[PDB]
């Protein structure tokens, strides 16, 4: 045939792939973690959004840390040969490097390690997207007025917030990040490359949201999401 280019991931496998959504709203009393009002709005928005992208969506609610690890291990042992990609969305409490099960924290690296290029062979060379709505620390942004491959290759972490910072969730509307992500996917998934979609998400969160709190410490604060890309190709959700 004629000249061929390989700058973009092959996304025309028989299936787009799994979208695992872990929605942790209610936490064991002994953890002292607050209920995450608004997260069901996020989970429903994500389900619809990724449904329209032709992902096989599996929603899981209120998993313990043991259940999260087992779920991830089991999913990583599935045969993904006919799937183009893998998506996992984590909605929970967190710290830097950490996501909360209902009964306590799990290392993010433990979860993602199951999908390493050497450990999940049917996803080797395919994009593995981890979308994370969770805090990464306790900083607040005051704002300003205006032939081998690496086993860590082909991962993308779409973090809701900058390293070290809280992440914001509205109890009625859902989280700022997931709200914005779903809106930008809806509008641009049939026309923009994924990093450019996520950049529009960055702008939306950065410009259209500001916290309101009766507590001066938490009032009038801002958020910027952080794209962490170790992808090796452009990613378009459409093909042909």
């Amino acid at each position: 045939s004629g000249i061929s280019l390989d700058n973009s991931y092959k996304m025309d496998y028989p299936e787009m792939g799994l979208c695992i959504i872990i929605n942790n709203k209610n936490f064991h009393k002994s953890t002292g973690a607050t209920s995450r009002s608004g997260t069901d709005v996020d989970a429903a928005n994500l389900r619809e959004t990724f449904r329209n992208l032709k992902y096989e969506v599996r929603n899981k609610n209120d998993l313990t840390r043991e259940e999260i690890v087992e779920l991830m291990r089991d999913v990583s042992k599935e045969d993904h040969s006919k799937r183009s990609s893998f998506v996992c969305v984590l909605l929970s409490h967190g710290e830097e490097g950490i996501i909360f099960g209902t009964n306590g924290p799990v290392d993010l690296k433990k979860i993602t390690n199951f999908f390493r290029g050497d450990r999940c062979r049917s996803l080797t060379g395919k994009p593995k997207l981890f979308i994370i709505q969770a805090c990464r620390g306790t900083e607040l942004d005051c704002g300003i007025e205006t032939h081998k491959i690496p086993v860590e290759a082909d991962f993308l972490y779409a973090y809701s917030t900058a390293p070290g910072y809280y992440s914001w969730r509205n109890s009625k509307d859902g989280s700022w990040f997931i709200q914005s992500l779903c809106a930008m996917l809806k509008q641009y998934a049939d026309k923009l490359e994924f990093m450019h979609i996520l950049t529009r998400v960055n702008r939306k969160v950065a410009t259209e949201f500001e916290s309101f709190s009766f507590d001066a410490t938490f009032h009038a604060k801002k958020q910027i999401p952080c794209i962490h890309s170790m992808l090796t190709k452009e990613l378009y959700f459409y093909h042909h």
Partner: peptide
């Protein structure tokens, strides 16, 4: 508005 709440933090995660």
């Amino acid at each position: 508005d709440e933090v995660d």
